[PDB]
Amino acid sequence: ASEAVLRLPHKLRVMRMYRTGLKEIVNWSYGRHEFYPRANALRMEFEANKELSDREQIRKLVLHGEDLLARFRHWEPTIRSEFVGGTVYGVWPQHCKDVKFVPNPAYIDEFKQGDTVLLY
Amino acid sequence: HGLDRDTVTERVIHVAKHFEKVDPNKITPTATFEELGLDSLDTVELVMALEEEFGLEIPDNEADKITTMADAISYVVSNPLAK
Amino acid sequence: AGAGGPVKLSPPVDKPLPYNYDFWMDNGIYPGQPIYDGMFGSMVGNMSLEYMAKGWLVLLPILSAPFVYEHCIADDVTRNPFVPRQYPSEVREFLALFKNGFVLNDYSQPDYEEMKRRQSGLLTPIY
Amino acid sequence: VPEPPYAKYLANKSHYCPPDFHYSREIYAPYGGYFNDPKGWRTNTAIATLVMLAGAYAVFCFGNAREERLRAPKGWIPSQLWNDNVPTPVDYRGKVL
Amino acid sequence: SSRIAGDTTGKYTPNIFSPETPMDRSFSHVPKNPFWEAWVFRRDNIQREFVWTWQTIFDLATFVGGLYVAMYATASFCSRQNDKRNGYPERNYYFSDSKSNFVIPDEREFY
Amino acid sequence: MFLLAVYFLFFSAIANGFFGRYLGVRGSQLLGPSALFLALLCSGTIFYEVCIQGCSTNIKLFENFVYSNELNVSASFLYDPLAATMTLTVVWISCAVHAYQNLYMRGDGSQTLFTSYLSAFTGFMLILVAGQNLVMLFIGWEGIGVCSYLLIGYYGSRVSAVKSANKSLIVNKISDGFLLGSMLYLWFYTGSFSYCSLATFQIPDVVSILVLLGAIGKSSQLFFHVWLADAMEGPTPVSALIHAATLVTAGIYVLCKLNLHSQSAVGILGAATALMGGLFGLAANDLKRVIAFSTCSQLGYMMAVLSTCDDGADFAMGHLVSHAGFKATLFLSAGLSIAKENNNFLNRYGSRQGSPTLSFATTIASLNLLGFPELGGFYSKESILNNAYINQGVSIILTLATFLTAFYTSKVLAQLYLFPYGNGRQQKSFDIDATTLICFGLLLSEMLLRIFTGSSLSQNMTTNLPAHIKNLPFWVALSGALSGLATTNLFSSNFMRFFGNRGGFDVFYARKCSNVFYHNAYVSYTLLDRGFLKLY
Amino acid sequence: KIGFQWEKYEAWRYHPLLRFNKNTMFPGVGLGAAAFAVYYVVDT
Amino acid sequence: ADRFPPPKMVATQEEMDNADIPYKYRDYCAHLIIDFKECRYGHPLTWRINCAHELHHYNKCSYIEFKRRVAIAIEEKKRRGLM
Amino acid sequence: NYASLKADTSMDHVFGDSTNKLNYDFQLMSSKEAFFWNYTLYPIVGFPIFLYLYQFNKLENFEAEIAAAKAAKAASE
Numbered sequence A: 001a002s003e004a005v006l007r008l009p010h011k012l013r014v015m016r017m018y019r020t021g022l023k024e025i026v027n028w029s030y031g032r033h034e035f036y037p038r039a040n041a042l043r044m045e046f047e048a049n050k051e052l053s054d055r056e057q058i059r060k061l062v063l064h065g066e067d068l069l070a071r072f073r074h075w076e077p078t079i080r081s082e083f084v085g086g087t088v089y090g091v092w093p094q095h096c097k098d099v100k101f102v103p104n105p106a107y108i109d110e111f112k113q114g115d116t117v118l119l120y
Numbered sequence B: 001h002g003l004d005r006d007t008v009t010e011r012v013i014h015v016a017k018h019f020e021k022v023d024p025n026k027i028t029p030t031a032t033f034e035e036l037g038l039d040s041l042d043t044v045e046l047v048m049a050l051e052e053e054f055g056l057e058i059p060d061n062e063a064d065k066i067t068t069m070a071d072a073i074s075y076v077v078s079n080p081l082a083k
Numbered sequence C: 001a002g003a004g005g006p007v008k009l010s011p012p013v014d015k016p017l018p019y020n021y022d023f024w025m026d027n028g029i030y031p032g033q034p035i036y037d038g039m040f041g042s043m044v045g046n047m048s049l050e051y052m053a054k055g056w057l058v059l060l061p062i063l064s065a066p067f068v069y070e071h072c073i074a075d076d077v078t079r080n081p082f083v084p085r086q087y088p089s090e091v092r093e094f095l096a097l098f099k100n101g102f103v104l105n106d107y108s109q110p111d112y113e114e115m116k117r118r119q120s121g122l123l124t125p126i127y
Numbered sequence D: 001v002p003e004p005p006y007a008k009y010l011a012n013k014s015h016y017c018p019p020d021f022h023y024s025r026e027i028y029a030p031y032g033g034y035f036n037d038p039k040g041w042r043t044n045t046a047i048a049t050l051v052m053l054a055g056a057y058a059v060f061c062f063g064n065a066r067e068e069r070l071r072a073p074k075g076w077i078p079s080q081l082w083n084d085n086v087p088t089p090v091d092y093r094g095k096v097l
Numbered sequence E: 001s002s003r004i005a006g007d008t009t010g011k012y013t014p015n016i017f018s019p020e021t022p023m024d025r026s027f028s029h030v031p032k033n034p035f036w037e038a039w040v041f042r043r044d045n046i047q048r049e050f051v052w053t054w055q056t057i058f059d060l061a062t063f064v065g066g067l068y069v070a071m072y073a074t075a076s077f078c079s080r081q082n083d084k085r086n087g088y089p090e091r092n093y094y095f096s097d098s099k100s101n102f103v104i105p106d107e108r109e110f111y
Numbered sequence F: 001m002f003l004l005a006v007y008f009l010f011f012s013a014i015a016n017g018f019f020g021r022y023l024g025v026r027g028s029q030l031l032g033p034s035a036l037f038l039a040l041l042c043s044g045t046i047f048y049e050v051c052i053q054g055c056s057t058n059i060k061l062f063e064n065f066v067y068s069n070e071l072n073v074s075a076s077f078l079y080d081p082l083a084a085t086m087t088l089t090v091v092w093i094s095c096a097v098h099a100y101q102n103l104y105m106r107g108d109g110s111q112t113l114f115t116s117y118l119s120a121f122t123g124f125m126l127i128l129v130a131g132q133n134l135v136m137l138f139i140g141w142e143g144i145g146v147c148s149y150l151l152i153g154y155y156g157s158r159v160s161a162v163k164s165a166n167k168s169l170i171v172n173k174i175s176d177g178f179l180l181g182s183m184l185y186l187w188f189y190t191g192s193f194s195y196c197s198l199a200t201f202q203i204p205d206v207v208s209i210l211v212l213l214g215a216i217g218k219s220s221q222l223f224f225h226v227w228l229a230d231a232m233e234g235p236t237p238v239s240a241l242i243h244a245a246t247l248v249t250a251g252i253y254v255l256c257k258l259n260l261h262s263q264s265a266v267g268i269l270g271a272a273t274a275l276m277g278g279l280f281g282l283a284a285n286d287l288k289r290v291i292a293f294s295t296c297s298q299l300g301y302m303m304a305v306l307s308t309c310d311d312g313a314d315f316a317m318g319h320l321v322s323h324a325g326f327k328a329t330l331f332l333s334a335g336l337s338i339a340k341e342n343n344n345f346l347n348r349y350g351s352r353q354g355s356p357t358l359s360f361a362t363t364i365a366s367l368n369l370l371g372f373p374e375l376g377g378f379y380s381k382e383s384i385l386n387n388a389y390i391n392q393g394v395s396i397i398l399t400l401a402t403f404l405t406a407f408y409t410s411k412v413l414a415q416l417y418l419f420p421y422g423n424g425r426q427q428k429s430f431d432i433d434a435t436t437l438i439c440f441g442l443l444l445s446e447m448l449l450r451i452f453t454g455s456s457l458s459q460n461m462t463t464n465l466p467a468h469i470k471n472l473p474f475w476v477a478l479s480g481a482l483s484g485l486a487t488t489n490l491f492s493s494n495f496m497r498f499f500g501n502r503g504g505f506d507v508f509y510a511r512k513c514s515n516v517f518y519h520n521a522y523v524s525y526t527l528l529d530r531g532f533l534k535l536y
Numbered sequence G: 001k002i003g004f005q006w007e008k009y010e011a012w013r014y015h016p017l018l019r020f021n022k023n024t025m026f027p028g029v030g031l032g033a034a035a036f037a038v039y040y041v042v043d044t
Numbered sequence H: 001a002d003r004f005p006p007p008k009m010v011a012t013q014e015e016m017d018n019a020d021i022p023y024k025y026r027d028y029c030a031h032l033i034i035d036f037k038e039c040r041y042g043h044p045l046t047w048r049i050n051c052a053h054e055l056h057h058y059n060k061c062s063y064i065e066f067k068r069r070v071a072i073a074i075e076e077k078k079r080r081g082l083m
Numbered sequence I: 001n002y003a004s005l006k007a008d009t010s011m012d013h014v015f016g017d018s019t020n021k022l023n024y025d026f027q028l029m030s031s032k033e034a035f036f037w038n039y040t041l042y043p044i045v046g047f048p049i050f051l052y053l054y055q056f057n058k059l060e061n062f063e064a065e066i067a068a069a070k071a072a073k074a075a076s077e
């Protein structure tokens, strides 16, 4: 688990584990057909331990699930192309206005363009 | 393309219906997930399903801030890559 | 749409820069990258170099097992059930010249020893 | 922002240009602009084709002058139509054609 | 707020009194960043942070002097091989102590 | 007549890249394909004259390109049977890609510059192939290297693309440094740079190792394969050209042109590369990356076959020319699939109504890759596998490589067509014009002609092997295909992760080689010249 | 079943136009087979 | 080797040079490969159907030569006592 | 004058915030590790040097042994 995940509150930490687990189900699948049963299985895995109230056991489950989600990070995340980490992100980025263009550059003081040696 | 609120509302309402617990009239353009009857783990699934519906990737910290039907529509409207 | 897609601009530097900040490549778009990916920062698949070395340690003996038998354990007489291609004397003498030839392994020939020493030739030019 | 006066001399956005894509029209590049399609492109392509064929004729003369065949072809080759230095064909058996 | 300084016709005059900022060569100058400037200053004046430590001496010796020693040894070996190849007598190189005066081969001689 | 094709390609490059303002996007879309069509006619004439009718020609453009004392080299072109075949294959594929880029690159800003790069890229390949001496080959070699650098990094606002181009440039630099060493060796002890006087029956091992090290660069073999996978950052037309003919094949062409290789090294390296490429292509989830790893595996087969027999050079060239076709088709169809689905990941592809031509071309190219009987790829691959039986170690590894190749090829086919639709409910479309149909028709004509004309003279010559040995590759390919269709798990998650990281060759370079490189730079600069030797 | 009804939400993926057609992947294989059968009868 | 003597070489040096037969192909089968080569390059695209008799004859003679090679191998191996 | 140090937050909601930072210390390899890896890789670079050294030593040793045997044969005879 990263520092940002650790600093999160318990409710949001379990939410992060569920979100990352679902995304890793998507990454490790071969198609959308594999996703649904595996998503239901992850659903049941979280639902099984939701009613535990013993803090120490809950900490054990969260830590073990975080280790499992760290090990099964996919080498190739499935990311939409237009978003960060995507193929078409930055291919031809839209160029902004207010560009500093100097018109007729060579005709501004044409004879006296050059470097000068100034002395004391 | 900036997608108008009315269409985004229709599609978010369409996604929210598929939860069995949620009753088809409780979902309104302005309703929190709690009144709909959705849990936290359910809100994860709804945020993801919104990701397929509009073809976008929700960065996670914003995903936490989505807890209502209203703000989800606002986030989708804000996004210029939402389809 | 290939052209005109939205992009995130990397924030301007607001703190003193490290001396080796040249290791970071940033063109102004948000996801800047190391000069060589994997040199530092996030690792693809959360796999360290130790993991890859252990995996290679597992693989190499199995991959090398087919090669080691023929090259080392086997010998020219027992490698194959036949002798190399038989040629007329004029053709065979020319073909035996090639150090990278395939007639140098003909143990039936009376010039086998010289042919084998030709095959195991010089490492570097003498002159 | 009110477009500068020189914008009139600059050309418009082409049909192939996506409507959302913005580029600075003042930048000059020898390979062309961001989407080109200039007026008079057909005549320029015709001129380019004429130059290509004329250079092909010159290269053809040069190559034919410098094309050396020192071994007879096994059969008839198309070069015999245009170059006279082709040796008379001899087949695999050895008979001259 | 801006005006075109350059005139292709040749009637160019610099409007130092003009209310509008000329579009001169300084128009396209890069804005610059305070911390980047201090990084440039630090990197150029890296001799200020130079400290003689055993680690520094170790690095300098092992890489620089090591490469010099390796190159000198390789060059000496190549010279020895070439002397054997050419048939020359062992040449009196500067730091080699040889009791032979052979330095430059005689072109006229057959070796 | 022989010079004309190179003239046409370089004219297309100059016209589109320097006068493209006048020509326009349409002007490129005519002058490119028309010029390469004319070059295709010229290349067909060359192929008929040299290969079929056995008439080699030498054209000396000018003498004394470098004339310093004894060192003398001339700009000359010799079209020998190898050169004519490679020229025909290259020009055919490049004409197809130029037809392809008219519609694919219309949404790209600099289509004229892209066409100019593609045409100079082909021209330098033909200079490499037809050179009569080593220096002309080096010219073409460096020309294709620089053109790959300018084509992979076409998207300059992407850090990944420019870093991929830098990777390609650096690796290729090391390889040609080794080649230049071998060139100097051969000039010193043979008296010339020409291949005719280049012949040596016995060569010292150093020259052979230098030649092999130079060759494994462009023909990406093991420890030099890092750039090929990253070369996916470039546009799809670039990937087709580089993987099909221009870059990867050059090392094999050099090894076949000069038979200074050693049997022991080439066979082991090729078999290792084939197995590793198949294993890496197993894990990959981008459509484009799997095809690159398959290219690596096929290069491994071709390098391995040199060790087997005297006809190994002919078999390698035959597989080279056969491979260019269906591999180019696979990249072009994959690129069209990406455009239609706006996606690069195999999971979200699925069955969808499309053009019959593109799906058929994908199916037939994948069947050639698999080894489906009575196909051009089948013959050129069985010629290698059956003749490799004598080298027991090589044969085993190549048979497992055939299994892996079948598995991932069938998996890709099932995921692209048989699988249910996996992408989202959004309006996505790429309508194909008649030009793309002419492109795929040209590829399909190449594939069909390959069956009738063959790849090597000894292709159907008998290898005196038992029937169960001879027909074994078919059974291994069929088993791999059946396992791929079922999408079964073949390796544990640890080994799947290992293969997804491509063996960690790049992570080793990162952590040790690059860090040592920049620590040497730190010692050289900061400690020494701006340190010890800098005044206060 | 608890959770989002993923398969009902994505029941449009079985659209007639999103299904596999043998003709698209194998356009003229049947014609080749029929021609080979006729040529087989002739050759035999 | 002595027990299984080489066959007579039908193809002569001038014929092999006139057919441009590489030295690797000059293996007591050269005449048949001259036939196969001339017929293959005679029929550029129909050689697979037309040129089948010549290929068959070459493969037959090559099979006989391969049997001779295996016989030589067995004789040498039994002479050394390995079998 | 100087460029603004204020970032643009327009696209944070689309592409994520910039809060997360790199964990690298921007420091180089240790001196001890660098010594090992220089003295390992540089010899691998100079593989021709060792081949030439090996063959030259072999040639000189064989020549000297021939000379010694020649001296032995030319002493008695």
Ligand SMILES: CCCCCCCCCCCCCCCCCC(=O)O[C@@H](COC(=O)CCCCCCCCCCCCCCC)COP(=O)(O)OCC[N+](C)(C)C
Pocket (backbone or CB within 6 Å): D030, D031, F010, F013, F014, F017, F018, F110, F113, F116, F117, F120, F139, F142, F143, F146, F147, F150, F153, F154, F155, F156
């Ligand atoms: C061999 C005999 C015939 C020689 C013909 C050679 C073929 C053409 C040679 C033309 C001159 C070669 C050098 C041209 C200038 C080098 C710069 C260049 O090629 O491209 C420029 C700009 O291109 C030009 O304006 C001129 C190119 C015209 C034609 C270039 C053909 C390819 C060059 C050939 C490689 C030179 C070989 C050198 C080694 C042998 C920069 O391109 P990018 O860095 O990719 O950025 C472009 C923008 N974008 C990000 C969108 C891609």
Ligand SMILES: CCCCCCCCCCCCCCCCCCCC(=O)O[C@H](COC(=O)CCCCCCCCCCCCCC)COP(=O)(O)OCCN
Pocket (backbone or CB within 6 Å): C048, C049, C050, C052, C053, C054, C056, C057, C063, F222, F272, F503, F504, F505, F508, F511, I033
């Ligand atoms: C099929 C033909 C062969 C294909 C390539 C096969 C390569 C096989 C080489 C790997 C097998 C032997 C590895 C040596 C045994 C080490 C086992 C434990 C590894 C370990 O503890 O330290 C590692 C050292 O890196 C290392 O182990 C680097 C040693 C590698 C030797 C150089 C050989 C080239 C390797 C290129 C590909 C291999 C990638 C994986 C090595 C990680 O170090 P750390 O980062 O944790 O150190 C901390 C930073 N202070």
Ligand SMILES: CCCCCCCCCCCCCCCCCCCC(=O)O[C@H](COC(=O)CCCCCCCCCCCCCC)COP(=O)(O)OCCN
Pocket (backbone or CB within 6 Å): E061, E062, E065, E066, E067, E069, E070, E071, E073, E074, E075, E076, E077, I042, I043, I045, I046, I049, I053
């Ligand atoms: C204070 C500053 C200095 C402190 C730190 C110094 C530490 C460095 C010491 C090791 C340096 C590398 C080893 C070279 C010196 C070895 C010992 C010198 C004695 C010697 O010449 O032996 C020869 C060494 O082999 C050779 O010819 C050289 C082989 C090693 C060179 C290749 C390895 C690196 C390759 C990188 C490229 C560098 C060279 C580029 C051309 C072989 O003996 P012999 O048969 O020649 O007879 C010559 C009779 N002694």
Ligand SMILES: CCCCCCCCCCCC(=O)SCCNC(=O)CCNC(=O)[C@H](O)C(C)(C)COP(=O)(O)O
Pocket (backbone or CB within 6 Å): A010, A011, A014, A015, A017, A021, A024, A025, A028, A045, A046, A049, A050, A051, A052, A053, A058, A061, A062, A064, A065, A066, A068, A069, A072, B039, B040, B041, B042
């Ligand atoms: C590709 C491979 C995928 C890897 C999958 C690995 C993932 C491991 C899964 C197993 C780890 C766990 O169970 S982690 C389970 C940790 N257990 C607890 O937190 C008990 C306390 N539960 C609560 O406080 C709430 O019920 C709460 C659940 C937060 C929701 O709040 P709501 O009541 O408002 O819905």
